[PDB]
Amino acid sequence: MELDKTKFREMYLQNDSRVDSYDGKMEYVWNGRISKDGDSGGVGLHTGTGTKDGPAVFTFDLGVLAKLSRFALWAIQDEKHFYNDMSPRRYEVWGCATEPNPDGSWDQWVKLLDMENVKPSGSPIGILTEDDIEAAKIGDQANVPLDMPRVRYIRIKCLKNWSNNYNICFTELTFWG
Amino acid sequence: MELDKTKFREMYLQNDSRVDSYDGKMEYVWNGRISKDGDSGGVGLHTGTGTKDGPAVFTFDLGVLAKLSRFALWAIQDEKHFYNDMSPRRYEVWGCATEPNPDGSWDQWVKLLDMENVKPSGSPIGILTEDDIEAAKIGDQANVPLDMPRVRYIRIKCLKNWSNNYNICFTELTFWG
Ligand SMILES: [Ca+2]
Ligand SMILES: [Ca+2]
To answer: Using beta carbons and an 8 Å cutoff, which residues of A are at the interface with B?
Structure first.
């Protein structure tokens, strides 16, 4: 099944990135809307454009203990953001089963997924083919390996975005399990 | 019993006030620390000083369904904030038992408590007695009536703060039940 996004909850551990730049909010990435700039109802989350010391990190609660099967993520749905801007290019999804320590340490977390947003055409930043746009509307898609433990809490870490920095912005994610 | 603050979670319903001014964050009002400006570890939440159209409102999840018995709230613990600044003066606590509608409507919520932060000395703003200080370390304190329903979700509405507007800032709250 698709996990029930009405149960998802923002968390904030020490050293996590704020995600509320450009009127963003973490709850906007589980509002069931895959949005673009100018849409109503909260477009997505956004850490900003300022330098960071390392990869952006944020944390949330699925509200259920689940055996995960699949994961998807969508960039904000316009040319400004497709394979561009602060959209994520290399990123990770991590999980754990018991309450996250508020100090934000990685110790208890397990890495579920190594994600790469691949641009089908491989065109330079700012050029898009019809296949690049199609892929962006499908979203990044992954199956979670069967050996992963059941998890309830999630972290996303942005290793690099499409502008070669550590910020991240996007519109929606979905979990199944 | 004191409700387990490790389980509390921020929510964000449409039209809720952002509470992240001055490096604030909602989770700082259930971190177990009753803090003043300059302290480490997140001082409190703060909606800013912009003029609002109405009472500031924000929402959170207790993480359990509880029969509530008591509520307490502390202002940021220094003379700048005691009966001053954006510290709450008249405010309300509201609750419900089932998932909050994300449209932020009041329809499903029930008002649990009418709170007033009373300044013992009644002195003008900026003047503090020893009694006024002692009361502010003890915090606002209320018993929740036995005829209230069990609730899992909470809203706080700031009708008026000590600067005669709708903003709110404070360092910690506690629920028992
Ligand atoms: Ca969304
Ligand atoms: Ca606190």
So the answer is: 6-7, 9-12, 14, 18, 20, 25-27, 31, 61, 99, 102
